[PDB]
Design a protein around this ligand. Sequence first.
Ligand SMILES: *[C@@H]1O[C@H](CO)[C@@H](O[C@@H]2O[C@H](CO)[C@@H](O)[C@H](O)[C@H]2NC(C)=O)[C@H](O)[C@H]1NC(C)=O
Ligand SMILES: *[C@@H]1O[C@H](CO)[C@@H](O)[C@H](O)[C@H]1NC(C)=O
Ligand SMILES: *[C@H]1O[C@H](CO)[C@@H](O)[C@H](O)[C@H]1NC(C)=O
Length: 513
Amino acid sequence: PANEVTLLDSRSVQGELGWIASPLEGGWEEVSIMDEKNTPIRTYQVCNVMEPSQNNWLRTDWITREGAQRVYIEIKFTLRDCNSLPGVMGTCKETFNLYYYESDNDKERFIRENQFVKIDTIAADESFTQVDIGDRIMKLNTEIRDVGPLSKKGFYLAFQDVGACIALVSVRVFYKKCPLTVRNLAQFPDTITGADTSSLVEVRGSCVNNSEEKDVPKMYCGADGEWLVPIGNCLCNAGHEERSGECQACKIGYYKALSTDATCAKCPPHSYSVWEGATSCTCDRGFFRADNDAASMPCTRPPSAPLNLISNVNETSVNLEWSSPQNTGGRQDISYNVVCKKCGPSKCRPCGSGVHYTPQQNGLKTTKVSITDLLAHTNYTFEIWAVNGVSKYNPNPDQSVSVTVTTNQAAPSSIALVQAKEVTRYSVALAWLEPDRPNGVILEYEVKYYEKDQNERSYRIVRTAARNTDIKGLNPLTSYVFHVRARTAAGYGDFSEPLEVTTNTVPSRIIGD
Ligand SMILES: *[C@@H]1O[C@H](CO)[C@@H](O[C@@H]2O[C@H](CO)[C@@H](O)[C@H](O)[C@H]2NC(C)=O)[C@H](O)[C@H]1NC(C)=O
Ligand SMILES: *[C@@H]1O[C@H](CO)[C@@H](O)[C@H](O)[C@H]1NC(C)=O
Ligand SMILES: *[C@H]1O[C@H](CO)[C@@H](O)[C@H](O)[C@H]1NC(C)=O
């Protein structure tokens, strides 16, 4: 596996591994066993089970420990049951002994007779047998033992047969490491396991490119080569976000302003980021951000012109009313500034004075202002400007609309004749005269209507340029009241006397059928 590093494998070793036996003859014997396919595997067998005592040694070649302290030894072997051999009770054994000795000499010519250390007496437990199909062996035992802590450049493994009936099929020697990994944006290197089978090796992580440490990244390498639960983390730098084990630049159109931010966010309305790894979003053309700001908050724009600009005049005092613009851009910080003028295109200077202008004349949150005390018979002109937190960045006169007005201009008279031209079950067509004395240019007419009955009465308004209108979508057989008034730059005339019209049962020709 990725957590094991093989120091020796007898099955890999080609062509007579070869191993020192003592005695050289009559002890452990090398013989090749045939697998399913392909090549032979060198094994060692002895079954000297009729002898009173046996001491047969077999020793590997020198094995480097590399950097390992704790080394594992996996032995696969077969064992013939003493009971299956006739009359060998008392001589025959079911175990063999395993030893090692550490050495800096990789060239030892003879098996040592003293300095070895016993790893264990190895027994085969029957119930743990495996079927090995590859080498054609029905009952194979596998036992693993471990040694350490190892301090020298290498070591020799030795097998002592005391009188068993045994074939050593394979020997694999290895150490364990926790494999290279990335955890919480910190890299942890391949780490050789500790000195004992219980050891934990503390490893400090390194921040990946390109991120910064938040809390010191640390993780334990367990002796089984598994990492334990890490602590600490690194955070992706601004303009980057965690993907896989890496901090990758924010994708086009996306941004991350601070390292403490989780992931990349798409640029908010009317801002964009044209480069990867963006920490900011450039405002779109015609769009801005106020000094009081969040780069997460969308860019905004100066509003459109205020709507339904309506003038009323009384003597020298001009009262004005308007409505919120169609496009705020948008923000709720909108306010209005009024602009006075005197002309009658060229020149038209400010009319500068100490006038009011009540309540404000600038930075105004309401839709009304009353102007008082300016001079009497002259044409003035007003611009009402819709303002917001931006527009100091791009002021334009189309953030305002104008009304030309004449002071001391009288309001128009009332209408005094309004007629129902055609009545159907759902509609009333109206027509009316111009007022006797418009006293100026008529800008539009307003029809006001409602149900005669006060309960469930809804007041509605229709505006028109012409002197007629068709009021549609009404209740049938229902009594309604209509009034009309005209507007000029001097304001509204008084409404006409009420005209009462009851819808009838005449079919609608629009609906047909
Ligand atoms: C305010 O402006 C109006 C519109 O221009 C002026 O009315 C015009 O006056 C001239 C003569 O000065 C006439 O020839 C036009 O026929 C008028 N226009 C209209 C209403 O049709 C008015 O004179 C100006 N008043 C002041 C005091 O400047
Ligand atoms: C002018 O406006 C005020 C508003 O209350 C009103 O009292 C006064 O009657 C108006 N003048 C005329 C000519 O009616
Ligand atoms: C981070 O450093 C690596 C080398 O470790 C370098 O190759 C790379 O350019 C850096 N990351 C960026 C900005 O792509």
